Amino acid sequence: SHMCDAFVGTWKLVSSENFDDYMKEVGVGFATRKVAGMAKPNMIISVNGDVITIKSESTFKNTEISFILGQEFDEVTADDRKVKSTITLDGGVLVHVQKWDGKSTTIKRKREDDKLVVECVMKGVTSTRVYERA
Numbered sequence: 001s002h003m004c005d006a007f008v009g010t011w012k013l014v015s016s017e018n019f020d021d022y023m024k025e026v027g028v029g030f031a032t033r034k035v036a037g038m039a040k041p042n043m044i045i046s047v048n049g050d051v052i053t054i055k056s057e058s059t060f061k062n063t064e065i066s067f068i069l070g071q072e073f074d075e076v077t078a079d080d081r082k083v084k085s086t087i088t089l090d091g092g093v094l095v096h097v098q099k100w101d102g103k104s105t106t107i108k109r110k111r112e113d114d115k116l117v118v119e120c121v122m123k124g125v126t127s128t129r130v131y132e133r134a
């Protein structure tokens, strides 16, 4: 057993708060905000050796990242930014930093009770997204 055992599985979005304001702060345009904000993604997390894979499947986009903790990778996000990302484990929380165009956003994922809670921060603006097991 390991690092991210408690994250592994298939998860479904059940609530979102402040996501439009987070996307505004990130610089997402109107049409993408409206459509992306409607999405109810499933998130599929798996581990194979040192490689973690996170898939998001939704009506908007299907995305997948695979990474090793601490090791930077390039990501094209669901809203089409070209970012450089590094994901680490800090006290049991997966911390995902995305950098582009001199900007940065941090996405934290943690297990709380039977949920997976995702907190997305851009400057002073936070969005909280809660997932339950599918």
Ligand SMILES: CC(C)(C)Sc1nc(=S)nc(-c2ccccc2)[nH]1
Residues within 6 Å of the ligand: 023, 026, 028, 032, 033, 036, 063, 076, 077, 078, 079, 080, 107, 118, 120
């Ligand atoms: C910002 C958006 C929704 C316009 S674009 C986008 N693309 C990818 S791939 N991932 C995300 C993402 C990942 C984790 C938490 C919140 C968002 N967003």
